[PDB]
């Protein structure tokens, strides 16, 4: 009953951010402290809870959300942010309780001719609600003439590829993100530390 964190962090395959992956963590003990100092993580930020203290808490459920963005967008994965990621792809609530973990994956997620497998939502009408996952591929209507599912002028496919080349500036390189959320319900607690 150790927590299946290696399934999240060492997953061979990561979701595009618009289609962000969610994993329920339940019925185990989580040793966060080995992660907190791993130093392979360029980001480890906690909100509403304290790191160096995580191993002493108990929670009803833990969700691990994971996806790929470019390193320059990692600041958007935090409460109260704006930008194309926070507004249209992955949105944390103001009262978020959890931790954001990120790390450069240029060696895995970047291809010599460019890797175009990872995508984000560019065109959307309004902002996502917190923890909303929009996987629509409807043609986006920029004018008043409806599109009838054809692309064209004022009629744009709403998703775009990042284009990760190994020559990219570090801000435009792929990063993998894991977001842990700590749900404290009115039920018995299932994830705790040592």
């Amino acid at each position: 009953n150790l927590c299946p964190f290696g399934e999240v962090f060492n997953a061979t395959r990561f979701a595009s951010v618009y289609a962000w992956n969610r994993k329920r963590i339940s019925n185990c003990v989580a040793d966060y402290s080995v992660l907190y100092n791993s130093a392979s993580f360029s980001t480890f930020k906690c909100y509403g809870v304290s790191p160096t203290k995580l191993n002493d808490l108990c929670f009803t459920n833990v969700y691990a959300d994971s996806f790929v963005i470019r390193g320059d967008e990692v600041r958007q994965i935090a409460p109260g942010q704006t930008g194309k990621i926070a507004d249209y792809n992955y949105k944390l609530p103001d009262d978020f309780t959890g931790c954001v973990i990120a790390w450069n994956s240029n060696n895995l997620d970047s291809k010599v001719g460019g890797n175009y497998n990872y995508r984000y939502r560019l065109f959307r009408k309004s902002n996502l609600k917190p923890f909303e996952r929009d996987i629509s591929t409807e043609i986006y209507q920029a004018g008043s003439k409806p599109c009838n599912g054809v692309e064209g002028f004022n009629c744009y496919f709403p998703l775009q590829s990042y284009g990760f080349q190994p020559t990219n500036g570090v801000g435009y390189q792929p990063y993998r993100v894991v977001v842990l959320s700590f749900e404290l319900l009115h039920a018995p607690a299932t994830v705790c530390g040592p």
Partner: antibody
Framework: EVQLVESGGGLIQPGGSLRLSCAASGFIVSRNYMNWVRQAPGKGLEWVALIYSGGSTFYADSVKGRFTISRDNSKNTLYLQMNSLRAEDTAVYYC???????????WGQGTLVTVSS | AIQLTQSPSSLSASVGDRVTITCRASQGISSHLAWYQQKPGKAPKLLIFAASTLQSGVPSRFSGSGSGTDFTLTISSLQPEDFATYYCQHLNSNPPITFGQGTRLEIKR
């Protein structure tokens, strides 16, 4: 028959205030990324402000805290409120529709703002 | 963050010549670059986006290429109406966008 029609430019005393307008036809401003770009006389293009359809706004450092970009959906119009104008703000101001990965495809004709006493 | 530097800063060439302007990005921006043409008194006009896609309506004698840090705009057979200043832009999907400083093109005759 897409067009963006700007107005509101002209002469303004240093430290004064001014509002530019951009009236669009051929697309819906509240559904698009929109920018103001400016060009000082004889110089290059400088990005000024950006509004998202979702409502988020962003600004060049050189205008942060002085300018406000907004829109009126009913009039299909984009605005640029400029306060505390200084001489370095003298420029032709363009509005443009932004297809972010596809470039800035439609621009207004420009409105010259002269900050002078 | 990204500086874009155009080269040369100005240039002259005769009708029918093949002209090439370069834009150099201080870091790899991978293919997120557009080219604009500005005629005196007019707004810039989009020519190329994603570094090589011709904007609709633009004459096919205009073409672009490159990726990473080094990009080029090419006019295959120069025409008198191609007198302009040409700008490259970083197609940044987050803000800041930036522009190069411009390349002035005049016709020799």
């Amino acid at each position: 028959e897409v067009q963006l029609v700007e107005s509101g430019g002209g002469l303004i005393q240093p430290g004064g205030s001014l509002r530019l307008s951009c009236a669009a036809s051929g697309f819906i401003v509240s559904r698009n990324y929109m920018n103001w770009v400016r060009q000082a006389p004889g110089k290059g293009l400088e990005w000024v402000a950006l509004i998202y359809s979702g409502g988020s706004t962003f600004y060049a450092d050189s205008v942060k805290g002085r300018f406000t970009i907004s829109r009126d959906n009913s009039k299909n119009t984009l605005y640029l409120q400029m306060n505390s104008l200084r001489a370095e703000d003298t420029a032709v101001y363009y509005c443009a529709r932004d297809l972010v990965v596809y470039g800035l495809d439609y621009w207004g004709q420009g409105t010259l703002v002269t900050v002078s006493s | 963050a990204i500086q874009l530097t155009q080269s040369p800063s100005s240039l002259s060439a005769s009708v029918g010549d093949r002209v090439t302007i370069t834009c150099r990005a201080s870091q790899g921006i991978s293919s997120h670059l557009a080219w604009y043409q500005q005629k005196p008194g007019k707004a810039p006009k989009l020519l190329i986006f994603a570094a090589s896609t011709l904007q609709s309506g633009v004459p096919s004698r205009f073409s672009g290429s490159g990726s990473g840090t080094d990009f080029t705009l090419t006019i295959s057979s120069l025409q008198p109406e191609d007198f302009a200043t040409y700008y490259c832009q970083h197609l940044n999907s987050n803000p800041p966008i930036t522009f190069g400083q411009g390349t002035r093109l005049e016709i020799k005759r």
